[PDB]
């Protein structure tokens, strides 16, 4: 006993805190027996865990382990026959119970499983304990570790290790031991060999119905014969009879069909859009009434703002009296204004804000003054002390900040109010609920009323979204067929002119669709404009886009300027169509425009499907779609109709029609109704399965199927694989034939298709599912209410104020913070919050202690008001109640009486429904084996150890159904649990590895996508057959059984092992997926249960209670959830399309190439030897695809004029720009958290928009729009703000920093300060790069801030105090100076510089836009800006002094001076510092060409062309990772330790100086962290994403020419002088002694600046080759560098070949026995075609032009596949060069061996049984050569390009090049002398400092002999010669003579 005895002593360090601890310790220590030891230890550890865990929550440990019934029976509580459950911790108080069940699971999977299994068993008890008992709150304590608060967190793991060692030492079944060790480890993919895989007598029939026809060994020729016979049968049995699927166009018939389907003729609607649509009539009325025709108001608006602000404090705990105090204040101030200045109630009110007998009040409410004074008459006589209390309550316990000096305490004099009421007579609105046409004939109006129409529509949309902002917790004073006399309705205002305004009246609040009424007011006379009914959250697009739409339609119309007379008819039609589209948002319009797009696509080409016209019609309702459909059809006809002269310019027509059809992106996609969309999604999901007949009913969810379930499953599996190859009846039903599958498999296995199994890189390396879309699941509500009631019970150690509600606001997302956290909720969110509040309050009330609901759901919180009248509810709640209500409001709210307080607070208010609910809930109207007793404490019983063919002993792969929003129609969505998510992840990783091993598929490979793009473009330009095939129902039709059979039939051969990998685990996971369970949404279930003909509703009602229970779980055969098996489906489609293209190539002798995307494909067919003889081919292809599970949609098109792939249309010559799509994308998706991120998003969108040649005048309008949006929110304009205005075509070669710099430069007219700052930045750049002495000191100088850093940089460059006081005067207001703007926006429920966040995002791995922007504008009005505290934005902007000193007026509200911000100086930063930072950042980013000055320069709007960026980077262009990390670690150590690198295991490479001290990353990174709006480090680690820009020529000629000359003024070195001085130094250094011509004598010279001077277009004299080699960092030494005589060209081509040597040696046994060849030929004549190994040694004698020679031999090893009879089959090739040859020689050799008449081509192969006769020794022939030819891939082994002899060679390191007298000496022979000039001064400058005297002697004696080979007399014979005379060497100058 080693560890048995040590365990007793090691556990002695335990504290017996409770009695149970000691009581179990005395028994454990006094019992030494192996059989109970493990059990006792595990149970004592579990008791530790559970006791600590629950005692942390005010516990009472369950020591009896008794049931709930007995613990309820202890006190006096009746037994409702509750289900048996054993609780871990219980706490009973009054009539409330808290149950806590704790556990421990170290892995997230089993933890989530246990939590979701415990929450349900705790929740299913409340339904029985609440009906005739008490309430409860369930709590679940889940711990992912064995840690606690009793031990030092170091003994638990020791005890665990000792226990597992004792267990593995001795035991005492098979799986109970594997889970115990697994459930005590710490952390621990495929290869699940630990499983058992036991059979259950059911997988037998599965394998018998799945793998009977699968053989995968069919020959090649028999398939050819079968396809020939099938084609011959198809030609004369189904095609000659007229049962095809495609047909020719006959464009006239298509025009007639569109005119019949689109242009309605049997309709009663008129041909005028204004009198059909109500909104169009309204806007027409307003625009034709507007076009054809003072301290009082500001004081009123200020006091309106004050009262609206004070209303938000809710300091009165009541809504009625608050509004009464407010309108009292309002009427008192109104009568105080009307005391004098008689020209105020009529002049500054009628033209201001007042209407007939109505005044504006708080919360945008309009109230009648008669009703106002009448309600003021109340509260008097019965409560005369009201005004006094309300006046004395605003002084104490109040903010006490108010200007209500006299307008508050004044008693309202009623006589003056009556006089005012009699002044203006009642003219109240009518609120029209539920034939002559005079609408000016829009087609013939002026060019001014349409722009006014657009302006009015924009104003109306703004008014609508402003009505959307109305608060939710608002109730009118008095409540309310076809006409309602409005008196207390909500109203919004909008200004249109100088006097007339427009009023918008409505009665409801929230985000629902409402009915509105629009009125006008010219000079006080309130007229009537109309009424309508719409949804406010569907008009966000035109809020300010009144100029963008005008510009885009003007440009789209001018596109057709080729015929003067055609655009005049299409312009107004287009504008009216756009207008009608904006005024009527609907999905039907989007579907109609998509159908029109498909119609145009089919019209452009030559062949189209026969079922096309049935996919274009849509049922129109509300008579609003008729007009838009008629307009679209008329436009299409006007553009397409014509006999002969109808296609003068067809490209323009096609582009115009495409952009018109793409107008569907203007209408948003925000699910007009959620319940209907969910129902329709369920319909579309479950309809095909009911039609097929395999949808089973609720399974056991454990892996146990009944006999009928497995019977119907096998029946469906058989029906799936029961399709023949001849019957034409099954061409639209799912299923596949096994014969064609076996054919394709056997054809793919034997390397016949374009793909093979030669893959590399072996791939074997808490929400609820029943509710998706709900903001809060039941589990989260229950957890929140339990936590809150637990906190409130812990606090009571009574009385509780409303602060408990604050707790609800703290855990879901002090009156100010309460209001700030409460404003950020939506209508459904506030309803859920009220529900949670009600639950918490009733729970606390029960802790403190009509008959139609018992038979129905006994829940009182869900009783609907739609079953009872309102008069009964209003009269019953106001009855006699003595002990149910209490006197007073009782703000303190002690415990025990909260129920009465709630009833009284609800009764004093206006609403009585909550009063009735509280009244009802008050009236009490709701009344020793180790396998069974050891899996309840902490045993992970649900761990996977043994699985079956349908489950995994841990579930059945449950899923959840939902929808996803799209333009045309909603898409499906499946979300899974964690286990099935991991399984799908493994499957998709395996399949994506297999696909990445493939080539032709393009889904996660942009290279193949670009290849397909260029192939399609070339085919369209040449005129090949392009066929775009879209497939219908790809998701809901595929089945996992097809993939199972496919993977069973494949082999997946390894690259180098050829091992036939066993796909056992993959097939197991696929069998698991085949039996997945899809759970239906609960909303559809309730909608079909509560309760038009619907098939899925019929199935629901048929399966409701007939066969079983209500359907909640649906399993079937063919599901293939969309977005689950995407990669497997992609690979299957790829192989099927390869088989199909092979079949087509073999049958119709054409050349097909196919590209796939797992949903649609594109086939480019090159035909031999107009296109009317290919219908049989395409219909045969369609038939063959329908034989598989690849049904083609009628939207697929075949032609030769236009191609489509991934919504990218290519036509002859160019590409369609798709303007309107990008325009609508820019106008939409306004997601704003801060103005900076919105500016950046709009920047990216406008960049990618202008990339596709849109315009330069429209982007300016979008920038102005976003500027106005950020200004309207109350932020005010900032110098940076949104995208600059008045831009140019220089979005190319320009980033966000460049356009910010352009904006800042445009701020100043005559740039002298910014030019000086640019000069200082250029000086810093030169001194840091050329002078190159600056590092990490600028880091110390910049970290301070902006002011001192700028003057420090200036004094480093150079300045005086004048510059300090001059440049630093320009200031701008930065509101986010002491941090960021605090705000809580409309986020989902349940919840430091930015560079750190971007880096964290890089290392690591349903909401509307209108509501988001509304919440943004609302949250930008509270206390947001921070200091020291928080305050307002207008409070800061009100402190600026209007000095106006001729320097702060060049741009108001943008640039100020210093003394103008003396009141507020904390938010004041210089803009010139930001300009300096931006200039330096652009310099470190994209070159120094931005330091010069901007100069201005001195085309039919249709000349488009492509341009490329002209950027030049000096920042180490590669710039990968592990460089910014090192710079941060060096510069910011504390910032690198904290907030960075906890989630990193590769710190060693980032620490060992991986290319440390980058050129500029050191200083170009510190400006990014301090400035909050640069963002360059997050930009440098990103690609251009465009790489090309299509632009018009008209914008290229009007751009600014900003190209900088060299800052050194061309004065530095004149690189020609660099070259000549370097050559002079080299020649004079060589002419003192012989040196080798290696890199040792070229890099070792100072003037070798040739590696510098990035522009290397010109070399020195002759050394081009060695310079280009050094640019690649060559290690060469010397060779014959005589490129003057071309060694790469004019080379002998004496090429030949040799025999081969087969690997996998089997020939040595059959080589010698021939002594024959006959038996060998007979052996070569089961089939034994194995792999073939070819070995070749090709030796050539490549010569050169100069005197030289070279012998070069190449070894070629080819791994191919032996053929049956025809030629051969190839897999891979490899080459290895060798021999003696120069770089040019080997380059020529390797280029010609890859471009020779050899294997690539005719192969020039001479077999003749010759090389076989040499390998297989024999001297006989059998009169049969059977010549073969290779079809090699075309690999490119051209990666040496050096002097290297390619890793092998018998000759190395000879022929050294030396230099003695300026002449190349190869071995002693003179080649030539290159000319070098010195001009006299240079030679003496070199002679100055030398080694000794004899060196100078040698140099000057060898100089003139080299002068004989040169020509230089320019050496000045003057005083310089007298200086050279210092070296008295007359003999040297007199020896040459
Ligand atoms: Mn497509
Ligand atoms: Zn009309
Ligand atoms: Zn000023």
Question: What are the salient characteristics of this protein?
Answer:
binds manganese (II) ion, 1 chains, globular, alpha+beta, binds zinc ion, 4-stranded antiparallel beta sheet, CapSnatch_bunyavir, 1937 residues, 6-stranded antiparallel beta sheet
Any overview of this molecule?
The chain has 1937 residues and is of the alpha+beta class. It is globular and about 135 Å long. The termini are far apart. Helix 35 crosses helix 38 and helix 37 runs antiparallel to helix 38. The longest helix has 23 residues, at 1126-1148. Strands 4-11-19-14-18-17 form a 6-stranded antiparallel sheet, sandwiched between helices. Zn(2+) 2 binds at residues 1443, 1445, 1448, 1457. Keywords: Cap snatching, Host cytoplasm, Hydrolase, Magnesium, Manganese, Metal-binding, Nucleotide-binding, Nucleotidyltransferase, RNA-directed RNA polymerase, Transferase, Viral RNA replication, Virion, Zinc. Mn(2+) 2 binds at residues 88, 1030, 1204. Mg(2+) binds at residue 1160. It catalyses: RNA(n) + a ribonucleoside 5'-triphosphate = RNA(n+1) + diphosphate.
Topology:
Blueprint: H1 3-10, H2 19-29, H3 34-55, H4 68-73, E1 89-93, E2 96-104, H5 108-123, H6 126-129, E3 135-143, H7 156-169, H8 176-182, H9 203-210, H10 221-239, E4 246-248, H11 251-261, H12 278-290, H13 295-311, H14 320-337, E5 358-360, E6 366-368, H15 369-377, H16 386-392, H17 414-423, H18 449-467, E7 490-495, E8 501-506, E9 514-521, E10 526-534, H19 548-558, H20 567-582, H21 587-604, E11 607-609, H22 625-640, H23 650-661, H24 674-692, H25 707-720, H26 738-749, H27 778-795, H28 803-812, H29 815-823, H30 827-848, H31 852-855, H32 870-876, H33 898-908, H34 913-922, E12 958-964, E13 971-976, H35 978-997, H36 1006-1022, E14 1025-1030, H37 1040-1049, H38 1064-1074, E15 1077-1079, H39 1082-1090, H40 1095-1102, E16 1113-1114, H41 1126-1148, E17 1151-1156, E18 1160-1166, H42 1175-1187, E19 1197-1199, E20 1202-1204, E21 1209-1211, H43 1219-1227, H44 1235-1250, H45 1259-1272, H46 1296-1307, H47 1313-1329, H48 1337-1342, H49 1347-1357, H50 1361-1367, E22 1371-1372, H51 1394-1403, H52 1409-1419, E23 1425-1426, E24 1430-1431, H53 1433-1437, E25 1469-1470, H54 1471-1486, E26 1504-1507, ...
Parallel strand pairs: 2-3, 12-15
Antiparallel strand pairs: 1-2, 4-11, 5-6, 7-8, 8-9, 9-10, 11-19, 12-13, 14-18, 14-19, 15-16, 17-18, 20-21, 22-25, 23-24, 26-27, 28-32, 29-30, 30-31, 32-33, 33-34
Helix pairs in contact: 1-7, 2-3, 12-18, 13-14, 19-20, 20-22, 21-22, 21-23, 22-23, 24-40, 27-30, 33-34, 35-38, 35-41, 37-38, 41-42, 43-44, 44-45, 46-54, 47-54
The structure holds manganese (II) ion and zinc ion (2 copies).
Manganese (II) ion binds next to strand 14.
